[PDB]
Amino acid sequence: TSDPIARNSDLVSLFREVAATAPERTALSAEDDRISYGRLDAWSDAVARTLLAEGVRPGDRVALRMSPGAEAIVAILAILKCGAAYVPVDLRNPVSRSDFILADSGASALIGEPHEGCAVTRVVRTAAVAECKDAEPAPGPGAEDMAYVIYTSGTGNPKGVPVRHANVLALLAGAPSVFDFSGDDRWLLFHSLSFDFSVWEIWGAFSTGAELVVLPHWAARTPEQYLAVIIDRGVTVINQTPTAFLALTEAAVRGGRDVSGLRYVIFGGEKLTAPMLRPWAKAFGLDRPRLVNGYGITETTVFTTFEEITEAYLAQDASIIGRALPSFGTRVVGDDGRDVAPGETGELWLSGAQLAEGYLRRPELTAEKFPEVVRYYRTGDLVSELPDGRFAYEGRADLQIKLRGYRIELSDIETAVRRHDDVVDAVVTVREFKPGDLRLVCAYVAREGSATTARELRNHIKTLLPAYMHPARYLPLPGLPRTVNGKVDRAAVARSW
Numbered sequence: 001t002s003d004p005i006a007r008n009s010d011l012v013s014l015f016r017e018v019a020a021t022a023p024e025r026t027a028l029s030a031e032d033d034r035i036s037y038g039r040l041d042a043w044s045d046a047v048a049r050t051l052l053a054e055g056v057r058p059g060d061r062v063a064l065r066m067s068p069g070a071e072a073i074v075a076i077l078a079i080l081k082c083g084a085a086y087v088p089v090d091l092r093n094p095v096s097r098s099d100f101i102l103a104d105s106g107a108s109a110l111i112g113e114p115h116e117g118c119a120v121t122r123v124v125r126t127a128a129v130a131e132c133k134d135a136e137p138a139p140g141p142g143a144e145d146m147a148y149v150i151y152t153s154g155t156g157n158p159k160g161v162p163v164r165h166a167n168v169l170a171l172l173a174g175a176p177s178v179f180d181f182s183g184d185d186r187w188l189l190f191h192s193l194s195f196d197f198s199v200w201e202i203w204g205a206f207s208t209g210a211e212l213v214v215l216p217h218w219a220a221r222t223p224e225q226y227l228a229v230i231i232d233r234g235v236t237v238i239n240q241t242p243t244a245f246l247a248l249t250e251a252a253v254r255g256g257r258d259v260s261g262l263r264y265v266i267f268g269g270e271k272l273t274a275p276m277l278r279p280w281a282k283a284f285g286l287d288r289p290r291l292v293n294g295y296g297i298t299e300t301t302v303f304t305t306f307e308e309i310t311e312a313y314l315a316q317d318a319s320i321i322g323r324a325l326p327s328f329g330t331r332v333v334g335d336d337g338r339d340v341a342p343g344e345t346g347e348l349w350l351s352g353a354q355l356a357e358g359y360l361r362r363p364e365l366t367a368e369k370f371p372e373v374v375r376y377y378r379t380g381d382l383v384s385e386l387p388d389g390r391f392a393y394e395g396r397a398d399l400q401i402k403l404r405g406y407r408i409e410l411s412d413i414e415t416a417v418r419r420h421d422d423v424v425d426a427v428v429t430v431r432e433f434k435p436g437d438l439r440l441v442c443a444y445v446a447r448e449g450s451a452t453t454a455r456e457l458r459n460h461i462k463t464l465l466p467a468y469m470h471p472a473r474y475l476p477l478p479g480l481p482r483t484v485n486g487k488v489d490r491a492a493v494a495r496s497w
């Protein structure tokens, strides 16, 4: 086969082949600064040498604390080239979380800038990375070697998820069952390196020989700045949370921007419903760009299912995550003796080459979350199979509570609220009214350009749910509060009340 993705079994071999084949093509751009594949390959070989001198060796975990930029990408390639795995430290981590991640992962070196009080002293500064830029530049990693460790909160200790070269290659090989990508695409590098969305951004581009466009620091604050850059730089593929997409849509429409240069907008990370999509579709249609809902988890290498948005999607009030990539086996499992009857809601279980080995030094947890039956991962997500095989996403599986004589599925209440045409987000929690009087309450976000009263929402819910599942109060918020890992911050919401 001529296909580099099918032919290579690790990311370093893949990158090296893509680069060597057409080394003058642009791999990475930052403003007007264009870095060719050949240049990037040599640059990262040089930085790898610097890491070798710091004792970095195959199997090592090397911390990475940098904002998404050219140097950070060079650093990633260098770490991988040393046969090591990178451990991204979110710049906006509380100091305690960073301390734990470094300790837990046994990071033996850090590249970039150490957070204040950082315990790792073996440091390759960003400046040293830049120094290597235009210089001349070991077996390299194998398929079963770790490429990165990304930590996912849930509360408890953050769980380290080691993902192998083979895991990522499985994802990259699955992508073309859904997407038409080529070396002429330009991908925006946007997400924090500590979020696995960035793994998809980086390797989506590199695996296809495309250009990775860095969002400049000046453009990092507003959707207007974001749009200016993606349009100016001829970006064809962007990746967004549904939340970010709301802001993008509003800026595009109000600013009269031309978005038709985009080929794909790819969603991940949150429940996607039609009210979040209808305004973009109204202005821009669904062809240029194509919109694709992606569902995935750190533990199964970024993405698991995709659903390309269609007119049909816009005409229904639920959330559809679509069909699983070819590597996956799936089960929808009840409590019980497991498998549910088609159409019924249960926990999604996943199998296949995209599954991580398990958590880092968490034998207890791994055994539970990665059971054998064929090895599976229990997503902790509730879904239901549609008549045609696509999955609808219901909610998280740990949201049942006990209240006033009932077991209550908070996820079902949230889903019912999300069915309202003028709601784009919602969180249901329990709070105290009178002492000894606890009740369901719902914080929600109105569709831009709409205003829905508590009374109207109560009336909406009356048609869908029994009275014991009715929120007692509603609270409109500009947006829901979010963690840096977030995603909605379910705990901060309770505080907003």
Ligand SMILES: Nc1ncnc2c1ncn2[C@@H]1O[C@H](COP(=O)(O)O)[C@@H](O)[C@H]1O
Binding pocket: 152, 153, 154, 267, 268, 269, 270, 271, 272, 293, 294, 295, 296, 297, 298, 299, 321, 379, 380, 381, 393, 396
């Ligand atoms: N398209 C999506 N729709 C609904 N939920 C999602 C989607 N993508 C990711 N998630 C949620 O995000 C979780 C994974 O987030 P992470 O903890 O960062 O790995 C999943 O288990 C889901 O709960």
Ligand SMILES: CC(C)[C@@H](N)C(=O)O
Binding pocket: 196, 197, 267, 268, 269, 270, 294, 295, 296, 297, 298, 301, 302, 303
């Ligand atoms: C970023 C999305 C695709 C998923 N991997 C997540 O962790 O939220």
